[PDB]
Amino acid sequence: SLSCDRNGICKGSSGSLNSIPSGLTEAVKSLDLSNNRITYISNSDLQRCVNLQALVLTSNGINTIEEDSFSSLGSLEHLDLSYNYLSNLSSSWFKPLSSLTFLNLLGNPYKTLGETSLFSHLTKLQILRVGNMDTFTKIQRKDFAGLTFLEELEIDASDLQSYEPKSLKSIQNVSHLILHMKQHILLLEIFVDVTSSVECLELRDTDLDTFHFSELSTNSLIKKFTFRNVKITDESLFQVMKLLNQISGLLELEFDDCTLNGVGNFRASDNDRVIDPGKVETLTIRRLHIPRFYLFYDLSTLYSLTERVKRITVENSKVFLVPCLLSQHLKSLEYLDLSENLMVEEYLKNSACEDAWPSLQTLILRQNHLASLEKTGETLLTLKNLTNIDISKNSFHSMPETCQWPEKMKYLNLSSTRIHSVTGCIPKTLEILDVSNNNLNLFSLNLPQLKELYISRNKLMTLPDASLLPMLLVLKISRNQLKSVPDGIFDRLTSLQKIWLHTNPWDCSCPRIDYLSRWLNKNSQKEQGSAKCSGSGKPVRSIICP
Amino acid sequence: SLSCDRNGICKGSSGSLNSIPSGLTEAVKSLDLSNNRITYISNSDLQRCVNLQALVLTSNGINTIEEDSFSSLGSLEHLDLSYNYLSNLSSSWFKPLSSLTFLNLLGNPYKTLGETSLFSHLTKLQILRVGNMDTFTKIQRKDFAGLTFLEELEIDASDLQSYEPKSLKSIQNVSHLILHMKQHILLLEIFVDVTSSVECLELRDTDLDTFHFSELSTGETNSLIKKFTFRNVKITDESLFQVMKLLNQISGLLELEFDDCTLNGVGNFRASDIDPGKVETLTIRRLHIPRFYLFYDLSTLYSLTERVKRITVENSKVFLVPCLLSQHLKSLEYLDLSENLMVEEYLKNSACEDAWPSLQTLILRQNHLASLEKTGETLLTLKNLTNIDISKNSFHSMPETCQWPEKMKYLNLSSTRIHSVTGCIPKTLEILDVSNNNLNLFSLNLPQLKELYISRNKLMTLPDASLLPMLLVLKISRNQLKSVPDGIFDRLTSLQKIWLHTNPWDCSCPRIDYLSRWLNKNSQKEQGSAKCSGSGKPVRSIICP
Ligand SMILES: O=C(N[C@H]1C[C@@H]1c1ccccc1)[C@@H]1CN(C(=O)c2ccc(C(=O)N3C[C@@H](C(=O)N[C@H]4C[C@@H]4c4ccccc4)[C@H](C(=O)N[C@H]4C[C@@H]4c4ccccc4)C3)cc2)C[C@H]1C(=O)N[C@H]1C[C@@H]1c1ccccc1
Ligand SMILES: O=C(N[C@H]1C[C@@H]1c1ccccc1)[C@@H]1CN(C(=O)c2ccc(C(=O)N3C[C@@H](C(=O)N[C@H]4C[C@@H]4c4ccccc4)[C@H](C(=O)N[C@H]4C[C@@H]4c4ccccc4)C3)cc2)C[C@H]1C(=O)N[C@H]1C[C@@H]1c1ccccc1
Ligand SMILES: *[C@@H]1O[C@H](CO)[C@@H](O[C@@H]2O[C@H](CO)[C@@H](O)[C@H](O)[C@H]2NC(C)=O)[C@H](O)[C@H]1NC(C)=O
Ligand SMILES: *[C@@H]1O[C@H](CO)[C@@H](O[C@@H]2O[C@H](CO)[C@@H](O)[C@H](O)[C@H]2NC(C)=O)[C@H](O)[C@H]1NC(C)=O
Ligand SMILES: *[C@@H]1O[C@H](CO)[C@@H](O)[C@H](O)[C@H]1NC(C)=O
Ligand SMILES: *[C@@H]1O[C@H](CO)[C@@H](O)[C@H](O)[C@H]1NC(C)=O
Ligand SMILES: *[C@@H]1O[C@H](CO)[C@@H](O)[C@H](O)[C@H]1NC(C)=O
Ligand SMILES: *[C@@H]1O[C@H](CO)[C@@H](O)[C@H](O)[C@H]1NC(C)=O
Ligand SMILES: *[C@@H]1O[C@H](CO)[C@@H](O)[C@H](O)[C@H]1NC(C)=O
């Protein structure tokens, strides 16, 4: 019915509640009545919850809340009324909430935030979420009256129809503004009011296929502009970039789950010259969709705009070519993440043409279609500054006796590559090596500089030799088939700080487990997790021998 | 060390041989002395083999051949002097060979065929090969004087410097002409002489990057060429339009093939201002794109495929077949995209509105396809698709129900890493291949199936024959079958071929009676020989009480 813990954290999980339970007291610290059938909130339901710090009523279907229902909740810090049936909000609900830090009103069918300012008394408010998908159609200038500083403001303006000018300009500082909006009609009229107050701007759900930029009635404080679930065409992209051109200090541009398509027979004619890269140094593209029946587009002229970009992530976005032309324009690129794409070694060699990627130090090709460890090593050889190489989750299966790798390489990730053994293919220059989640039985490579070895989720029968890994700081060797370890082994690793030994079938026979059980107790702070004995589920740490 | 036969077949087994044997026989019908160090040929080393029909001397060090050394060879049919050190050719060697059918002279460092016609008396010659990669630089008009009909003519003119006009116009019919030529300078001058005589033209090794078409005043558009093959040829996006112009001279061209060719850009070429002709089959194999290629855009050529019926683009780095192209492929009935990298999702872009209306056979073997369900759905809208080969793709598993083109009669799921089969396989099938997988059971109801290929699995029990009434073919070899249900084969009234070999058949007589008796009564049906597990003795060779 209503289950609490020893410290007043209460939750109503049954879902068969028709009203707020009776007999709530000053000992209730948190009240989670999510996903119940509560319909009414009277002035007496919560009068004795003077110590209530969090009140969650998500997805209940609350019709009405009496004016003074929250009169006693002066210590409430977290109020979630999202997804109920409140079509009319009263400023008297929030007047007593002097300690309120989080307020969520999303998903309630109000057309307006009322004719009286709701948040004038929330002097401590930090996170405000407001709006809905269907009926929220007006933003008024009074709506955000007494709010000067907010950490996060989320406005679901999905079907907003009108925006009263300067409604949002009253908020001086907003670290993160999230704006849902299916159409772009109101986009530029909201932008002028928040461009000077927002640090991280996020636009969600908007259809920008036919977006056109027009000069603004206006410097900007936005450092990051995120587009999520947004639709863009090759034509409207140049308009979007003109909007980004108004943000002189923009550092980071991010497209998550967006859609890119052609308008049909569009060409780059005069937009090419009038585009300034600005100070954008990080580009992040995730899960870019291209319509199933797409119209072809050619945005190769945009390759030349990347000369100053330092950090690029293009994840899970159907990349099977990175042309040499593009890679040669990427003169400042230090970090490239191409995870979850369709790159094959053959075309990766074109990407590494002469004078390609001079500054690149980190290359991530996790979960592409890479097949040969050798060809990959030779492909990356001409990238002289490459130090971090992640080629995990590629079905390599095996490695030859000897390989070529970039000379400065110090981090190599061979996780989830389906290998059954390791060879000298792995260079001695490595400081960090990950060979987790494979099918290794042995690891006996001489890596005199290796600081960190990750080798969990294998079939290791014996610990690697400590003489071969002198400088080891970290050894993650959990989830193997280790039964014992040579006595005195860990004193050999003078620099050892963290070690994972759990999920191994440790033999806890006293004439053998003595050293390990003792070492664990003296070094409990080094062990991550706790090694258990095979038969009994008792920690090896708490095993003493005569 | 010469192993000879009573039928006259002799061999030069040992490789360290210095000369042709002395005192030969009238009973020699063949002579293979390949990979020897023979250097000389006198008239007395082979004056007795008047019944000789073949003579092979490849990879020898023959420097000279005395005049009339072949005087006795009046019935010789096969002469191979390939890869020797002959730099001077005499017409008296081929004077006596009135019955010669095959003559190979490739690989010899002669600069020309000589001032005397060499093939004037070879009235029955069918296959002639001549030239080499280093020194052959001239073709005189008399080179091919007395040759009227030939089945194959291979000319390795890699370093051809000069070509006398009309040298090859004398030959009236050549079914297959193979021409090696590094340069294209003499390409057009040789084409006009052969276009009326050649049926299958093959051009090898030529660099056509800067080839420009210039029409000769022949006006003999009446060409005999039906197939034009380019092998190991380098073409650019610019010169490709010039090659098309050359192909335009061949009004009757049916087949165009590029094997191991290279396509690249010249840097900044744009297609703005073509007749497909009769070309109905296009073949592209192992097309290479240079490591540091120059980008090219030949999408304008998509519109030239509207009359092609057969297309093979194998192992040519295909990620995409855009909807525009597949909409233009109106006549295409057969598409082989084996050994490519077709992104599974935009396989669905290829099957857009009005795509591939005539396509009956689609081969996507050995791409990177991952989902059987997504593949079948992608192909559903291709109404005329009857043959689908998606073998050698790592599907791993299949769901309970799938959607496939309603007319599908042939499905190839070989080498697909499946451990079981479900009703995803549609009942319309007549041919199913699920070979080289990890199946333990096959019990689908396929009332129309006539051929089941299911070898290289782990079948412990025969597929339920009651569910395959129309089976003509059952290849169930290389499995784990130990026994068979009694009378199973009686129900298969239309059975014609069956593979049972390489199974651990338990030859315990109180158990194996039916199978051993059936195989004896139906010997002509078994392909291979079923062997007993214990002993390697045939199953049909054991009779039970
Ligand atoms: O816009 C682009 N990139 C920018 C956005 C990127 C970005 C920039 C900066 C920062 C961040 C990101 C891409 C750039 N850009 C081109 O340059 C381009 C231009 C024309 C053609 C074309 O039209 N071509 C016919 C090809 C051709 O010539 N075909 C005929 C020869 C064949 C034929 C015809 C008839 C019968 C038989 C055969 C041509 C081609 O493929 N050329 C070879 C050079 C290239 C290649 C292929 C394979 C491997 C290596 C090289 C190129 C193809 C590509 C296409 C764009 C593109 O990819 N558009 C999307 C629609 C594409 C897509 C769809 C689905 C999945 C994934 C992507
Ligand atoms: O944009 C790109 N990469 C940048 C984003 C990456 C990045 C990395 C790091 C930092 C910053 C950015 C990639 C670049 N790029 C292209 O250039 C390109 C696009 C399309 C085609 C095309 O049109 N082709 C028809 C094919 C073809 O012609 N097929 C027909 C010939 C065959 C056929 C089949 C059946 C019957 C008859 C004919 C062509 C192909 O696949 N293979 C051709 C080479 C071979 C061939 C064979 C035979 C004859 C001729 C040619 C290739 C060719 C090339 C595709 C993009 C790509 O791979 N994915 C893009 C969608 C991704 C994206 C976009 C925007 C933002 C983020 C991600
Ligand atoms: C929400 O509830 C309040 C509470 O009654 C409504 O308040 C009335 O608003 C009208 C405006 O036309 C005033 O004339 C009344 O005096 C108000 N009454 C009270 C008690 O405040 C308010 O109208 C409701 N909102 C909507 C949209 O109906
Ligand atoms: C199913 O597909 C496989 C290929 O995955 C076919 O097997 C090949 O058959 C051809 C005969 O045309 C041989 O030349 C190849 O050597 C075979 N390759 C392999 C890997 O076996 C098979 O024939 C198809 N099944 C049919 C057509 O019934
Ligand atoms: C708030 O915005 C003003 C506008 O200039 C800026 O000076 C100030 O640093 C910002 N404060 C925070 C905490 O971001
Ligand atoms: C490598 O990085 C350094 C920066 O430390 C830079 O100066 C140099 O140009 C880069 N290129 C090579 C080849 O080292
Ligand atoms: C190696 O890559 C995996 C993902 O495949 C990741 O989870 C792991 O943290 C990486 N190893 C490192 C960073 O040492
Ligand atoms: C080739 O041989 C014949 C006869 O041995 C001779 O007459 C002719 O001059 C020779 N040619 C050369 C170039 O030696
Ligand atoms: C299939 O092929 C037939 C030719 O027999 C053609 O008439 C029809 O339009 C094609 N497409 C279909 C049936 O969808």
Interface probe with B: pick from A342, A375, A379, A418, most Cβ of B within 10 Å = A342
Which tokens hold the place of A265? 């027979």
Q: Is B4 exposed, middle or buried (0-12, 13-18, 19+ CB in 10 A)?
A: middle
Residue in A292, A323, A349 nearest the CB of B291: A349
Q: Residue A228: which of A271, A177, A264, A189 has the closest Cα?
A: A177
User: Candidates B293, B297, B328: which one to mutate for ligand 1, based on the most atoms within 8 Å of Cβ?
Assistant: B297
Across the interface, do B317 and A293 touch by the CB < 8 Å criterion? no
The count of domains in chain A is 1
What lies within 8 Å, CB to CB, of B5 at 6+ separation is none
Which tokens hold the place of A161? 């129809």
For Cα atoms A260, A263, A264, give the angle at the middle one, nearest 5 degrees.
125
Instruction: Please indicate whether residue A337, judged by its CB atom, sits closer than 6 Å to ligand 7.
Output: no
Instruction: Please indicate whether residue B358, judged by its CB atom, sits closer than 6 Å to ligand 9.
Output: yes
The Cα A405–Cα B152 span in angstroms is: 51
Size of interface A-B (CB pairs under 8 A): 32
The method recorded for this entry reads X-ray
Instruction: Please indicate whether residue B407, judged by its CB atom, sits closer than 6 Å to ligand 9.
Output: no
Across the interface, do B292 and A325 touch by the CB < 8 Å criterion? no
The Cα B418–Cα B396 span in angstroms is: 5
Please indicate if any CB of chain A lies within 8 Å of the CB of B346: yes
> Which residues have C-beta atoms less than 6 Å from ligand 1?
A 290, 294, 296-300, 302-303, 306, 318, 321, 347; B 289, 295-299, 301-302, 305, 317, 320, 346
Give the residues across from A286 on adjacent strands.
A256, A315
What lies within 8 Å, CB to CB, of B131 at 6+ separation is B105, B106, B154, B155, B156, B157, B158, B180
Which tokens hold the place of A289? 């969709």
B266 half-sphere exposure, CB direction, 13 A CA radius: 15
What strands, in cross-sheet order, belong to the sheet with B207-208? B207-208, B234-236, B262-264
Nearest CA to ligand 7 atom 10: A413
Beta pairing, strands A30-32 & A54-56: parallel
Across the interface, do B343 and A342 touch by the CB < 8 Å criterion? yes
Q: Which residue of B has its CA nearest to A345?
A: B291
Interface probe with B: pick from A261, A328, A350, most Cβ of B within 10 Å = A350
Across the interface, do B343 and A293 touch by the CB < 8 Å criterion? no
The Cα B149–Cα A484 span in angstroms is: 83
Range of the domain at A222: 1-546
Residue in A292, A293, A350 nearest the CB of B293: A350
Instruction: Please indicate whether residue A358, judged by its CB atom, sits closer than 6 Å to ligand 6.
Output: yes
B459 half-sphere exposure, CB direction, 13 A CA radius: 29
A320: distance to nearest CA of chain B, Å? 8
Residue in B317, B349, B368 nearest the CB of A293: B349
The Cα A373–Cα A169 span in angstroms is: 56
Report whether A443 contacts A475 (CB < 8 A): no
B156-167 burial, b at 16+ Cβ within 10 Å, e below that, comes to bbbbbeebeeeb
Residue in B295, B319, B324 nearest the CB of A320: B319
The Cα B381–Cα B376 span in angstroms is: 10
Nearest CA to ligand 5 atom 4: A197
Give the start-end residues of each E strand in A229-383: 231-233, 252-256, 259-261, 282-286, 311-315, 335-337, 362-364
Please indicate if any CB of chain B lies within 8 Å of the CB of A432: no
Instruction: Please indicate whether residue A126, judged by its CB atom, sits closer than 6 Å to ligand 5.
Output: no
Q: Return the HEC string of A450-488.
A: CCEEECCCCCCCCCCCHHHCCCCCEEECCCCCCCCCCCC
Which own/partner contact pairs does A210-217 have at CB distance under 8 Å and 24+ positions apart?
A: A210/A184, A210/A236, A211/A184, A211/A187, A211/A236, A211/A239, A211/A240, A212/A236, A212/A239, A213/A188, A213/A239, A213/A240, A213/A242, A213/A243, A214/A188, A216/A188, A216/A191, A216/A192, A216/A246, A217/A192
How far, in Å, from the CA of A511 to the mean position of ligand 6? 56
Q: Which residue of B has its CA nearest to A292?
A: B349
- Chain B hits for A346, Cβ within 8 Å: 317
Q: Which residue of B has its CA nearest to A353?
A: B292
- Chain B hits for A316, Cβ within 8 Å: none
Q: Residue A299: which of A274, A267, A337, A335 has the closest Cα?
A: A267
How many residues are listed for chain B in this entry?
545
Task: DSSP letter for B20, please.
Answer: P
Helix, strand, coil in percent for chain A, rounding step 5 = 15, 20, 65
How far, in Å, from the CA of A276 to the mean position of ligand 2? 27
How far, in Å, from the CA of B357 to the mean position of ligand 9? 6
Q: Residue A380: which of A353, A340, A410, A341 has the closest Cα?
A: A353
Give the residues across from B149 on adjacent strands.
B173
Please indicate if any CB of chain A lies within 8 Å of the CB of B348: yes
Please indicate if any CB of chain B lies within 8 Å of the CB of A21: no
Q: Which residue of B has its CA nearest to A344?
A: B341
Residue in B293, B352, B368 nearest the CB of A293: B352
A333 C-beta neighbours (distance < 10 Å), count: 24
* First-to-final CA distance of chain A: 52
CA A287 to chain centre: 13
Which tokens hold the place of B345? 């999702």
Nearest CA to ligand 6 atom 4: A359
Give the start-end residues of each E strand in A289-376: 311-315, 335-337, 362-364
* First-to-final CA distance of chain B: 55
DSSP B345-391: TTHHHHT-TT--TT--EEE-TTS----HHHHHHHHTT-TT--EEE--
Residue in A292, A342, A349 nearest the CB of B349: A292
Ramachandran angles phi, psi of B244, nearest 5° = -55, -45
For Cα atoms A473, A479, A482, give the angle at the middle one, nearest 5 degrees.
85
Please indicate if any CB of chain A lies within 8 Å of the CB of B345: yes
Instruction: Please indicate whether residue A63, judged by its CB atom, sits closer than 6 Å to ligand 5.
Output: no
The Cα B401–Cα A513 span in angstroms is: 54
What number does the ligand 9 atom closest to the CA of B384 have?
Answer: 1
Please indicate if any CB of chain B lies within 8 Å of the CB of A325: yes
Q: Quickly tell me which residue has 């593209």 as its tokens.
A: A285
The Cα B412–Cα B79 span in angstroms is: 45
Q: Quickly tell me which residue has 């000298």 as its tokens.
A: A424
Q: Residue A10: which of A43, A56, A47, A46 has the closest Cα?
A: A56
Instruction: Please indicate whether residue A443, judged by its CB atom, sits closer than 6 Å to ligand 7.
Output: no
Q: Residue A231: which of A256, A255, A262, A207 has the closest Cα?
A: A207
Which tokens hold the place of B449? 């199936």
Q: Which ligand sits closest to the CA of B383?
A: 9
Report whether B73 contacts B100 (CB < 8 A): no
| Dihedral class, residue B537 (left if φ above 0, else alpha if ψ from -120 to 50, else beta) | beta
SS3 B282: strand
CA distances from B246 to B251, B273, B324 (A): 10, 17, 27
Residue in B341, B345, B349 nearest the CB of A344: B341
Report whether B251 contacts B278 (CB < 8 A): yes
Which tokens hold the place of A375? 């060809």
Give the start-end residues of each E strand in B215-305: 227-231, 234-236, 255-259, 262-264, 281-285
B511: distance to nearest CA of chain A, Å? 43
CA distances from A239 to A248, A467, A546 (A): 16, 62, 79
Report whether B450 contacts B471 (CB < 8 A): yes
Please indicate if any CB of chain A lies within 8 Å of the CB of B293: yes
Which tokens hold the place of B81? 């002097």
**Resolution stated for this PDB structure, in Å:** 2.3
Across the interface, do A318 and B345 touch by the CB < 8 Å criterion? yes
B321: distance to nearest CA of chain A, Å? 12
